[PDB]
């Protein structure tokens, strides 16, 4: 219909592409009289706004108005809201302060914007917090209005969440701070994620006070709304490099596609309203000196597949959200995009931003790799009902390749429980550090293939990680390459067979030749294992007999022992004890209790010269010397008979 698009910009968007923004648009023309008028104004005073509105409304009864702005003056949107209330004309905002988010519109005004609200932005930010399991947080609110609705929305969202959020009490500011009574509430902050809701002027003072407090640490996150994030050019020096912000400022979609979608929505509403009633276009004659409108009609609208439907308050249903961070180059780094319902993440691995400034010494970020072991590291899927690991599990990632022709893969994130997970959680409780837990992709524990290691040994020795919380056997060259901690559990080796006992130990007469006994029996180990190295250092002839007796999997060897495809097996003691304590039937019987066996322990391998080694050696003796290790053994072992 009669639609005028006026644009106030300094960014040189010319007029002729707007005249070319009418031809292929509305290919199936249901309104017969469609006329668009493109205008460009450089001055942004409300005098010219009222003047051009009174010129275009008298200009052959223009019914549609579309406006964008380049500056950051939010009063222009309020002026256009008053103009739409007086003139009864649906006006759309596109860019800048004419499209900023305000508190409460009126039913007397037919002005509409795009994008999300502060409640939908809070929902997106809590979705960010949910996807990263940052459940321990706080909330700091200033005297900027609309704050009690913000606090109540956070409370109702926590009350309507599958998380069970750990929310600290709301730190409410009163005036410009004396730094006497507000500092008492700031020293109560012991959480990690700090939620701040303020304006741009007070944010500098709040971040400077938090930097003076030392509350701008590596674990002390900062997530800010869109309105405090002002000019992209004007960036004060008090921002932490890694400042999380969420705003609808999208550079991939320019103003022309947005005004084309707005024209599509307006013509769709006009064409669907023309079938309901005929005399829909009725405007005011002149400024000097309606029953059926589109104010209550275009709640349902969808153009070109993109669901751009509206709400009953003046917002959209499915907007496009932008998640930006601050790099080390003091620039707003655009990272995250939002889907129609869920959230997309460009960086699935969250970056640390360990140094927000140059004078920030940090020593607590530790990279940990581990291996899947059934009594120790249980790796399972994420819960599809919550998209959240249960509290007693930790997140993990693994670089799993897609196909075998290329080497590209995906870091699939899963959940982890078990025994070493409990050890790592108690170390995080006591030592109070940060961990970076993930899975190994090369293979097993480690094997020197011609002065080349692999697996967790290749991750620790080449210093891509720090330590391994998971279980590891200890021999000579492993103690040569790294430094082990103190052991905590008495786990030697053992032999599983089918009370009578045939094998007495390593001094068995069966360990000489199976031709000596009338049934030719069989026993092997797991491939690529350190037990193989222990046998090859003990007896090479035993390795020569075991070469024809190899197998593949621990559960495969278990099925081979149950059915009868294997006679005996050599493994460690306590893992076989745990597998036999939960087995139905209990036909497989262990041999001894570690008498003619290796009788080694399980330690934590650290790098040569790590400062954490003494603290871990104190913490393990603290965990064993109070029965808490016995509590974990009661939790993760079942001693039957």
């Amino acid at each position: 219909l009669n639609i005028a698009v006026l644009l106030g910009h300094s960014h040189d968007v010319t007029e002729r592409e707007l005249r070319n923004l009418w031809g292929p648009e509305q290919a199936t023309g249901l309104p017969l009289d469609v006329n668009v008028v493109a205008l460009l104004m450089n001055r942004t005073d409300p005098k010219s706004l009222i003047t051009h509105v009174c010129d275009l409304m008298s200009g052959a009864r223009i019914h549609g108005l579309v406006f964008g702005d380049d500056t950051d003056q939010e009063a222009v949107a309020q002026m256009l809201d008053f103009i739409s209330s007086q003139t009864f004309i649906p006006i759309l905002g596109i860019h800048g302060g004419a499209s900023m988010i305000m508190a409460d519109k009126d039913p007397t005004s037919t002005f509409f914007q795009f994008g999300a609200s502060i409640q939908q932005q809070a929902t997106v930010m809590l979705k960010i917090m949910q996807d990263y399991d940052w459940h321990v947080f706080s909330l700091v609110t200033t005297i900027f209005p609309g704050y009690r609705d913000f606090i109540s929305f956070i409370k109702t969202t926590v009350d309507n969440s599958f998380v069970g959020w750990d929310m600290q009490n709301v730190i409410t500011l009163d005036t410009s701070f004396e730094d006497a009574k507000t500092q008492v509430q700031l020293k109560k902050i012991h959480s990690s994620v700090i939620l701040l809701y303020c304006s741009k002027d007070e944010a500098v003072l709040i971040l400077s006070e938090a930097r003076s407090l030392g509350l701008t640490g590596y674990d002390f996150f900062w997530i800010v709304p869109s309105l405090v994030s002002g000019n992209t050019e004007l960036i004060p020096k008090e921002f932490p490099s890694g400042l999380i912000s969420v705003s609808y400022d999208d550079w991939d979609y320019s103003l022309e596609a947005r005004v084309r979608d707005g024209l599509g929505i307006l013509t769709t509403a006009a064409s669907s309203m023309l079938e309901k009633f005929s005399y829909i276009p009725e405007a005011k004659a002149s400024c000097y000196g309606p029953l059926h409108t589109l104010h209550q009609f275009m709640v349902n609208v969808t153009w070109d597949g993109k669901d751009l439907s509206f709400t009953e308050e003046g917002y959209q249903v499915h907007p496009r959200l932008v998640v930006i961070v601050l790099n080390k180059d003091r620039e707003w780094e655009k990272v995250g995009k939002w889907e129609n319902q869920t959230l997309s993440l460009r960086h699935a691995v969250w970056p640390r931003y360990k140094s927000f400034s140059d004078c920030e010494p940090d020593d607590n970020h530790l990279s940990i790799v581990t291996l899947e072991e059934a009594p120790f590291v249980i790796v399972e899927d994420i819960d599809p009902l919550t998209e959240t690991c249960v509290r007693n599990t930790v997140p993990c990632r693994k670089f799993v390749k897609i196909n075998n022709s290329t080497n590209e893969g995906m870091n699939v994130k899963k959940c982890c429980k078990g025994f070493c997970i409990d050890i790592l959680k108690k170390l995080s409780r006591t030592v109070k550090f940060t961990y970076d837990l993930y899975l190994v992709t090369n293979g097993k524990h480690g094997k020197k293939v011609n002065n080349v290691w692999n697996g967790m040994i290749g991750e620790v020795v080449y210093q891509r990680a720090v330590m391994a919380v998971g279980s590891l056997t200890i021999n000579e060259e492993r103690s040569e390459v790294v430094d082990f901690s103190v052991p905590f559990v008495e786990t030697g080796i053992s032999v599983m067979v089918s009370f009578v006992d045939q094998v007495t130990g390593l001094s068995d007469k069966k360990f000489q030749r199976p031709h000596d006994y009338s049934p030719p029996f069989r026993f092997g180990t797991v491939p690529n294992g350190s037990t193989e190295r222990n046998i090859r250092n003990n007896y090479p002839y035993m390795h020569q007999y075991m070469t024809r007796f190899n197998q593949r999997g621990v559960e495969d060897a278990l099925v081979s022992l149950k059915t009868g495809k294997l006679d005996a097996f050599i493994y460690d003691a306590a893992v076989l004890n745990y597998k036999a304590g939960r087995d139905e039937g209990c036909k497989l019987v262990t041999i001894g209790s570690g008498y003619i066996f290796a009788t080694t322990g399980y330690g934590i391998a650290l790098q040569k010269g790590s400062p954490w080694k003494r603290q871990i050696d104190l913490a393990l003796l603290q965990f064993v010397g109070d029965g808490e290790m016995e509590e974990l053994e009661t939790l993760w072992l079942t001693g039957i008979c």
Binding site: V486, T599, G601, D617, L621
Partner: peptide
């Protein structure tokens, strides 16, 4: 004692028990 001196690797591995007479 780990806070005051340094420790080596343990050579013995055992637990505790109760001496009674029968």
């Amino acid at each position: 004692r780990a806070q005051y001196i340094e420790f080596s690797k343990p050579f013995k591995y055992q637990g505790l028990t109760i001496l009674v007479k029968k």
